[PDB]
Design a protein around this ligand. Sequence first.
Ligand SMILES: CCCNC(=O)O[C@H]1O[C@H](CO)[C@@H](O)[C@H](O)[C@H]1NC(C)=O
Ligand SMILES: CCCNC(=O)O[C@H]1O[C@H](CO)[C@@H](O)[C@H](O)[C@H]1NC(C)=O
Ligand SMILES: CCCNC(=O)O[C@H]1O[C@H](CO)[C@@H](O)[C@H](O)[C@H]1NC(C)=O
Ligand SMILES: CCCNC(=O)O[C@H]1O[C@H](CO)[C@@H](O)[C@H](O)[C@H]1NC(C)=O
Lengths: 171, 170
Amino acid sequence: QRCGEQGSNMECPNNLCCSQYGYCGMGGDYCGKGCQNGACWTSKRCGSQAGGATCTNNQCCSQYGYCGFGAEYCGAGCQGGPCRADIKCGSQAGGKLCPNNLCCSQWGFCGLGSEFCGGGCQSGACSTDKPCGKDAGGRVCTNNYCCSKWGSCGIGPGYCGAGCQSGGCDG
Amino acid sequence: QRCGEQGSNMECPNNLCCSQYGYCGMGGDYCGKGCQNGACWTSKRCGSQAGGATCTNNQCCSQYGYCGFGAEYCGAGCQGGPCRADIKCGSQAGGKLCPNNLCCSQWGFCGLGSEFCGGGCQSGACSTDKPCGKDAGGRVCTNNYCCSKWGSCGIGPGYCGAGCQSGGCD
Ligand SMILES: CCCNC(=O)O[C@H]1O[C@H](CO)[C@@H](O)[C@H](O)[C@H]1NC(C)=O
Ligand SMILES: CCCNC(=O)O[C@H]1O[C@H](CO)[C@@H](O)[C@H](O)[C@H]1NC(C)=O
Ligand SMILES: CCCNC(=O)O[C@H]1O[C@H](CO)[C@@H](O)[C@H](O)[C@H]1NC(C)=O
Ligand SMILES: CCCNC(=O)O[C@H]1O[C@H](CO)[C@@H](O)[C@H](O)[C@H]1NC(C)=O
C-alpha cells in the first residue's frame, strides 16, 4: 500500500498520486499539497531546470522542465522520459546510457521489449545474462549495476549486498 | 512496503523489475521468471490481444499487444500508454475516458500536466477539484471516483470510506 519516501520510492499504479504520507489515491489529499509522485497537481521539475533530475512514473520532461504526458511534454524539446523523438544511445552515441534502465538496442536506440533488451542489447535492462567479476576476467556490469558473488549483474541485496564484486555495491 | 501482488500493485521506480516475492530490483532474480511488473524479460500482453488489459509502468502497448518503449511500441499502431500519436477523449471523442487516469483536456486530448488537468479538464486526474454530492446539486464525479462527505472527488479511505456519497464507494 506504501509509496514514495515511505515505500522505497515505489509508484502507484495507473498514475495514482502518492500522498505526503506515502499512500496511494486520487484527489486533493493525494495529488495536492505534498504529493510525491503520480498525477500530482503541481508537476515536478526536471532536466536542465532542475539540476538534471528525471521524472517519475516514466513521464516526459518538457522543454520547460516540468513532467507530464502529451505533445507539450513528450514532443518538441522533450528532455527525458519516453520522448516522441527516438533516443540515441550506446556505441552509436558516445557510449551514452538510456535513462530509467531502458535497454540500448543493438542499433543504439533506447526502449524496452525484446528488440531492445534481447540479442545485441548494449546496456540497461538487457535480458542476455553476461557474466561479471573474478570468473569473467574482471568484467564489470553496465549502468554501474552490482556484480554478485555468483558473477551475475543486477540490483538488489543478492547483488549489491555481501559478496558484491563491483558496481554500486553496498560496501 | 512490497511491489506487485504483495503490495497493492505498487510499481518500482525507474523500470525496476518487481520479483515474484514483491521486491524491486534488476537482474535475473527480479526480471526473470516470476517478474510482476517493470522491465520484465518476458514482456506483458496488452491491448486487443489481451482483453483490453493496459500495460503497467506507463508503458506503450504496441500494435502487436506487447508492453514496452521506443518507436516499435509507442509509434504506428500503438494502442495505449504514451503513444507518439495524440490520443482523443471527452466530448470531442464521444465521451471516451483516457486510460490510467490521464486528464482529458478542454481540447479533448489525453495528457498529464496543468494544460490537461487544469481549467477545462473533462475527466481523469483533474486538479480543478469541482465540488460533488449533496452540496453540489448531486453532481457525481467522473471515472467512478468516490465523492467524499466533504463534497470532493477522489480515491482513498476519506473519499470511498465513511460518508462516501457516490462513485465506487466501499
Ligand atoms: C504549452 C504552453 C502552455 N503551457 C505552459 O506554459 O505550461 C508551463 O508552465 C506552467 C507553469 O506556469 C506549468 O504548469 C506547465 O507544466 C508548463 N508546461 C510544460 C509543457 O512545461
Ligand atoms: C490551446 C489551443 C492550441 N493547442 C492545442 O489545441 O493543443 C491540443 O491539440 C494538439 C493537437 O492539435 C495536441 O498535440 C495538444 O497536445 C493538445 N493540447 C491539449 C492540452 O489538449
Ligand atoms: C528491420 C528493423 C530495423 N529497425 C531499426 O533499425 O529501428 C531502429 O531505428 C529506428 C530509427 O531509424 C528507430 O525508430 C527504432 O526504434 C530502432 N529500433 C531499435 C530496436 O533500435
Ligand atoms: C513482426 C514484426 C517484428 N517484431 C515483432 O514481432 O516482435 C514482437 O513480437 C515478439 C514476440 O514474437 C515480442 O518479443 C515483441 O515484444 C513484439 N514487439 C512489439 C513491437 O510488440
